[PDB]
Design a protein around this ligand. Structure first.
Ligand SMILES: NC(=O)C1=CN([C@@H]2O[C@H](COP(=O)(O)OP(=O)(O)OC[C@H]3O[C@@H](n4cnc5c(N)ncnc54)[C@H](O)[C@@H]3O)[C@@H](O)[C@H]2O)C=CC1
Ligand SMILES: Cc1cc2nc3c(=O)[nH]c(=O)nc-3n(C[C@H](O)[C@H](O)[C@H](O)COP(=O)(O)O)c2cc1C
Ligand code: SF4
Ligand code: SF4
Ligand code: SF4
Ligand code: FES
Ligand code: FES
Ligand SMILES: [K+]
Lengths: 230, 213, 44, 430
């Protein structure tokens, strides 16, 4: 066995080489905050939520991408880690529209939950927010790109798993929009799964839209019968 | 300043466009320039070539570049929208770009601009009625020691006065191509008040080479 | 003789819009064969 | 040595910098280029890297990494993949146009530097990423490379060595963020110019997945002169750990803005008053100096008098050397407007991949616009400082630090002007 020894909050744990900081912290038992990282998608590292501090190192590393080394002590809840998380939440909510009561992600939104449990409680933004024009990609996804945070799970899902390669990011800077640049109907056999992997309410299930709310629903486990996959 | 395309009669995917055979030979040379299995690295130059065939990029060179290079068209859309060199709208024959970054703003590029509006009568981003000139404002173009400066097509005009750039406009209206260089007393980058250094002759080869080379 | 009073780089006044690409096409005959990645494309 | 500056004309590496000689092969070989290069290619990569390490040459891109260690990071056996040396010639940084003069006037020095660097690390071929707007400079470089290929200097059996080498030029498409080495590597591959995360470092995984070493134009072109003249000659200039000669671009409100080669440890005031003609209205008319362009904070006249323009002394002066671009602003300049224009330049040039820069640079642009109009409160200003502390150190690339630094320097050195402006606006309009 080639499992090297690392430390999380002063507690030792043995991991295989190539294990990320996020994976080691998950192995110890703390779920590191994240927005762009997905365990079934390629690593992007373009939201900086997962910034944690390794001790004796004057820079915060991205836990979703950076591999661990021997003897690394991951200070998961030190001062600068919380400062970085609060700054990232302030930047993320700087341009987000005040659309929670009209949203279909309200009550099941990653941004709201992580904003309460990691971010601050008031806004220093005294300027005007951006407004991105909406698109359409079919009658299966209600499309509101005003609420997108450019997490780039759309492009990775459409290129890696769905394998259609039609979604992309057009523009440079604050005017970058996650779209298709044309009036193209994004329609695959696994299209609706993008609705599951939007941490914000940018992409909404169109038939389900404006009909229910997660906290008033009852969840019952069952088996799909429309195909033989089960 | 938009990053979404609408199906216009002038700019549609059904607009006729094709490469010339000399452009096809240049495209094949650009493809051979890159390693095998990475033809997508030729997306950036070849599309540039398409601009040099038209002066602007409709949405037919994007699909054509995707067709030859066997890449998805959305990658070509991303490349053509991320960079500011690609003219996705029909610009004029002469493309005036004025630099207004801090080393150029300090040396009064606003007088050059005000000369351009007071001579041609168009705003920034506005076209002439005869579609000959298009004025836009750009960032630093790497001619900071020769500030103020403008560029037209691929030519640089540096150390300009309002009278000088007005004369450049009249010379362009006559059809003649100006001289792409600084218009002051200096030649490329030397100080105007004489040469500070490099007045001695070069010492030629073999000047103080280390022993055992 | 030694001359340092004339701008010798006057060639750039004689360049068209196809100088770089045609020069690359002319220069491609001097180049070695490129390495291969073992496949036609990453999507192949 | 104690007093520095006043570099001798025979010790200047970049002869024909102003274009007063021939830029072709005949003018290049008559100035000392391509001399005994076969011996350099034969003496070994370890000997070349040892000569580089003895010179003490540091990174001239703007970060000041030691070139010897970075070039020795490739001294590893091949693993079935080629190796590449890429020369960065994007030149998107305001205030800096030295590499443009190097490419336009002495391209053969750059070509010999590419060959020496490629042999120094076992690189199969070399790529040069030039700016899209530098069409004439790219054409001149192509002419020089064609004349080098036709004369048998590079290509098959380069310079009579048996080690083949290829030199390519890839033209850019007008982006400042493409100057960053990982964004440059991504832009060569046909993708968008968005930087990668390190690790994996480019020495392990770079362009096309192959090992890749990215180096600046002048730190490549100096290397043949390092290998010919000697390590001690190049290490004699400047202080320890700051050795070499640098190309300084002096611009702004100066009588004669120019580009001049100089020793490393030259004082700022001496350099301006000697090689540039001084600030208009006298030296006491100086208000602020940006030492190395947009990537470093400005300094006032009280510190500019007795400062040394190298890495360590300017780091001690809470700024950075960067690309060695002296931008000068005199007393008749609205420096709030200058910093606002700089931040707006950063807003128009930002790749937008990682969110702190993507949001905070536009936030800083709005705050700077309000500061220029004067519609601001004093308690906002410190908040702006905190915003910079949420950008510096939480970004994928270093454009976020280069955006936070000028605002921090402006606040720290000219807070009373900002308070006076907002107090005047509050007194007038309300
Ligand atoms: N020259 C120009 O036009 C401009 C220059 N800059 C300057 O560029 C700098 C930021 O660029 P960087 O090169 O990213 O800065 P720096 O943080 O990264 O690193 C310097 C060099 O060392 C290498 N390096 C460091 N540690 C390494 C390791 N462990 N393994 C392998 N390689 C390693 C990096 O790859 C890089 O090439 C700033 O100082 C900024 O002022 C900024 C804007 C424009
Ligand atoms: C935003 C950004 C832009 C940069 N632009 C350039 C550039 O235009 N030219 C350059 O040589 N280095 C540039 N760099 C620095 C490079 O990352 C790197 O230092 C350079 O390519 C080689 O460094 P070296 O001098 O140590 O070899 C830039 C860095 C950043 C973060
Ligand atoms: S995506 Fe989340 S934070 Fe944004 S409006 Fe909807 S519920 Fe609110
Ligand atoms: S729409 Fe949602 S999943 Fe897609 S990039 Fe934006 S935030 Fe990510
Ligand atoms: S700091 Fe800005 S320019 Fe750099 S990677 Fe992040 S978004 Fe891109
Ligand atoms: S989860 Fe690591 S940066 Fe997004
Ligand atoms: S600031 Fe205008 S050319 Fe650089
Ligand atoms: K969703």
């Amino acid at each position: 066995s080639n499992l090297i020894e690392v430390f999380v909050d002063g507690q030792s744990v043995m991991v295989e080489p190539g294990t990320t900081v996020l994976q080691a912290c998950e192995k110890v038992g703390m779920q590191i905050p994240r927005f762009c990282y997905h365990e079934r998608l390629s690593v992007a590292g373009n939201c900086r939520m997962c910034l944690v501090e390794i001790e004796k190192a004057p820079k915060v590393v991205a836990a979703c991408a950076m591999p661990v080394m021997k003897g690394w002590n991951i200070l998961t809840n030190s001062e600068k880690t919380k400062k970085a998380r609060e700054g990232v939440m302030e930047f993320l909510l700087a341009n987000h529209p005040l659309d929670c009561p009209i949203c279909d992600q309200g009550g099941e939104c990653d941004l709201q939950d992580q904003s309460m449990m990691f971010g601050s409680d008031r806004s220093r933004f005294l300027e005007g927010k951006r407004a991105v024009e909406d698109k359409n990609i079919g009658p299966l996804v209600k499309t509101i790109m005003t609420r997108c945070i450019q997490c780039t799970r759309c492009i990775r899902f459409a290129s890696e798993i769905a394998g259609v390669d039609d979604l992309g990011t057009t523009g440079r800077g604050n005017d970058m929009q996650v779209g298709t640049y044309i009036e193209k109907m994004f329609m695959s056999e696994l299209s609706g799964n993008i609705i599951d992997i939007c941490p914000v309410g940018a992409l909404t299930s169109k038939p389900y839209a404006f009909t229910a709310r997660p906290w008033e629903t009852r969840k019952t486990e069952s088996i799909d019968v429309m195909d033989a996959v089960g | 300043a938009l990053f979404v395309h609408r199906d216009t009669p002038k700019n549609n995917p059904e607009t006729p466009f094709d490469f010339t055979p000399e452009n096809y030979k240049r495209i094949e040379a650009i493809v051979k320039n890159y390693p095998e299995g990475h033809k997508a690295a030729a997306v950036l130059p070849v599309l540039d070539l398409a601009q040099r065939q038209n002066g602007w990029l409709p949405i037919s060179a994007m699909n054509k570049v995707a067709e030859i290079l066997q890449v998805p068209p959305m990658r070509v859309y991303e490349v053509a929208t991320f960079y500011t060199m690609y003219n996705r709208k029909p610009v004029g024959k002469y493309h005036i770009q004025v630099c207004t970054t801090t080393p150029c703003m300090l040396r009064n590029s606003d007088s050059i601009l005000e000369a351009i509006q007071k001579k041609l009568g168009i705003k920034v981003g506005e076209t002439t009625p005869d579609k000959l000139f298009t004025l836009i404002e750009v960032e630093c173009l790497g001619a900071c020691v020769n500030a103020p400066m403008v560029q037209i097509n691929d030519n640089y005009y540096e150390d300009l006065t309002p009278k000088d750039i007005e004369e450049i406009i009249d010379e362009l209206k006559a059809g003649k191509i100006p001289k792409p260089g600084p218009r002051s007393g200096r030649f490329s980058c030397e100080p105007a008040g004489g040469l500070t250094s490099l007045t001695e002759p070069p010492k030629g080869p073999g000047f103080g080479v280390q022993a055992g080379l | 003789p030694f001359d340092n009073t004339t701008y010798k780089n006057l060639q750039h006044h004689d360049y068209s819009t196809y100088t770089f690409l045609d020069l690359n096409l002319d220069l491609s005959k001097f180049r070695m064969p490129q390495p291969s990645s073992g496949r036609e494309s990453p999507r192949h | 040595k104690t007093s520095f500056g006043s570099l001798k004309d025979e010790d200047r590496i970049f002869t024909n910098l102003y274009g007063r000689h021939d830029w072709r092969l005949k003018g290049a070989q008559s100035r000392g280029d391509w001399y005994k290069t076969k011996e350099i290619l034969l003496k070994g990569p370890d000997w070349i890297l040892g000569e580089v390490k003895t010179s003490g040459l540091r990174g001239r891109g703007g970060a000041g990494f030691p070139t010897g260690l970075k070039w020795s990071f490739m001294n590893k056996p091949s693993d079935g993949r080629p190796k590449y040396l890429v020369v960065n010639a994007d030149e998107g940084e305001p205030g800096t146009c030295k590499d443009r003069e190097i490419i336009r006037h002495d391209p053969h020095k750059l070509v010999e530097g590419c060959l020496v660097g490629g042999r120094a690390m076992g690189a199969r071929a070399a790529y040069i990423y030039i700016r899209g707007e530098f069409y004439n400079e790219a054409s001149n470089l192509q002419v020089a490379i064609r004349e080098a290929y036709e004369a048998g200097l590079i290509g098959k059996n380069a310079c009579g060595s048996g080690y083949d080498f290829d030199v390519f030029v890839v033209r850019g498409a007008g982006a400042y963020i493409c100057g960053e080495e990982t964004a440059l590597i991504e832009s060569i591959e046909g993708k968008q110019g968005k930087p990668r995360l390190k690790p994996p470092f480019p020495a392990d995984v770079g362009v096309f997945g192959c090992p890749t070493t990215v180096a600046n134009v002048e730190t490549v072109a100096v290397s043949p002169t390092i290998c010919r003249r000697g390590g001690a000659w190049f290490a004699s200039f400047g202080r320890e750990r700051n050795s070499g000669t640098k190309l300084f671009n002096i611009s702004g409100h100066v009588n004669n803005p120019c580009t001049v080669e100089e020793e490393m440890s030259v004082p700022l005031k001496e350099l301006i008053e000697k090689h540039a003609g001084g600030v208009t209205g006298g030296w006491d008319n100086l208000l602020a100096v940006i030492p190395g362009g947009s990537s470093t904070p400005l300094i006032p006249k009280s510190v500019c008098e007795t400062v040394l323009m190298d890495f360590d002394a300017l780091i001690q002066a809470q700024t950075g050397l960067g690309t060695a671009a002296v931008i000068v602003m005199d007393r008749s300049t609205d420096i709030v407007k200058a910093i606002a224009r700089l931040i707006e330049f950063y807003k128009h040039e930002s790749c937008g991949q990682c969110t702190p820069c993507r949001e905070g640079v536009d936030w800083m642009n709005k705050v700077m616009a309000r500061f220029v109009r004067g519609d601001a409160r004093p308690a906002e200003i410190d908040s702006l400082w905190e915003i910079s502390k949420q950008i510096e150190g939480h970004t994928i690339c270093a454009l976020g630090d280069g955006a936070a630094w000028p605002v921090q320097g402006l606040i720290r050195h000219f807070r009373p002007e900002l308070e006076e402006r907002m107090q005047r606006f509050a007194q007038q309009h309300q």
